[PDB]
């Protein structure tokens, strides 16, 4: 029961529970990515740190959604967390491509829930996503795109390596 | 006259004036609640403080709306402030039930004005309410619901009292 | 591949991966317990905090095991995380009984892996568990047993309540 | 003579003296590695520092074992220290491969002495090795494996170099 629920549709409540699952699955995927890069035969500790930090950010996003579900009077429901899609993640370029696909999927789930909230005339839900999630995703996807371009630059060629070093070491 | 008004409907202007009245009436109701709990034959000073703080928060909400009305070029109009609905407020449980009814009514008035602003394509009004009022109301109603559950727990039974004390004194 | 693996059996490697699953499932169970107690119709915020802290401790235990798996040259493998066994957790007493069952199961899994490590003459694994997990579990189970006794004391009777308050408020 | 010896086998005493020899031989090997990298025709001062630090760590391990031998009432006996196996150590990759072989040999000698101590029911010896040597060796061998992977990455190819620089300079 709840004595607080007001203007909070059953459709939003259930979509919030699905989005918590998506963010906890993404956290799990980033935990697997992180520990893969800590393998002695892979040994890229900054790439491990990058993904382990993202694991923490996705768990915190799930926790914020769960706090909001209770603030609105909905009821958290948990489902199983699917294991990540790979057991080994390839090169840094493979891993960063998998990470941008994952973030694009989270961003589309946020936009779909925003559209539901707008259809349901739920401005608290719409502002919650705008304030705490939509720009976080735009900023992260921009960073990951910049990283993809620099990984390819570096692995690709002499001119690319040189251009990267000039930026990093002179400018 | 105004030389600043732009995209601000007469419908929103008048609804903002009505909402100022509602928030100043709510402030008045909480002033009455506060002083009732300060009576020597009632004597629950933390309950008096809880409501007197809410009186101040509702007056500040009215003042923010009035500042916004002038920022947009509308004209504040004041109406009489109806006296509160009761002269004596019963138990803490009665008073907290009356407070959650009052907040639900303020929250629905905010949602109604947001819907008007959206219909009028007034995004400054819609963001103003989202930023300064809708989450304040969700947070307060969640707190008041938590309080209702704990008041009933405590007044209700042995097991309830014990469970409350374990949470408060051990955890 | 690994060029570091030494004295680390495939049996231990696989049992470490199963134990990571058990600790991440326990973290998930405590996340569900935590948010249940944050419901407005339950509203025991110290009980929510108690379980949310335990969610964090169990995730950190899984992360320590995963770091160890890579330190030894084994390979992390993740499986799906089963959803928790309940969607609603009852009273504080129900929840604390479920938590002690969960910890007893983690403790027996630690003792089983210690016995495997001893059988495999793997003293690094055995000391790792002794140093970082076995006394943490004994201490937590002792605390949870103390809590069960005090919850029952408090919910049970006049004499019990009084005895608890004397300890908390005079001594 | 000793008036303190208790539960300390002649087999452990003699194996501790052999292990002191092994650790002082390893210190000697790392002193030779260090000064080879300080040659003007080799000139890799960070590699010289890496090995000179390991020379100091292995001498300190021998000193800890000798303190323990006297704490237990055994008698230190020293043997000649064989010169290191090479006079010149090749590339950084050659040297790091020689260092991981050396550490694996020290780790197996520790595991063999732990097994002797366990067979002799000498828990003080077994805990001494667990506490002060077995995890130090696991951690060092993990670091050396990470280093081998990064040396090969860097010397091997364009893509490898680029991937290393992205990790070091962007992440």
Residue numbers in the entry:
A (entry chain A), B (entry chain A), C (entry chain A), D (entry chain A): 1 to 171
Sentences copied from the publication:
Ferritin is a self-assembly protein cage consisting of 24 subunits with an 8 nm interior cavity. The 4-fold channel is composed of four E-helices forming a parallel four-helix bundle with C4 symmetry. Herein, we have engineered and constructed a gold clustering site at the 4-fold symmetric axis channel of the apo-ferritin cage. Using a series of X-ray crystal structures, we evaluated the stepwise accumulation process of Au ions into the cage and the formation of a multinuclear Au cluster in our designed cavity.
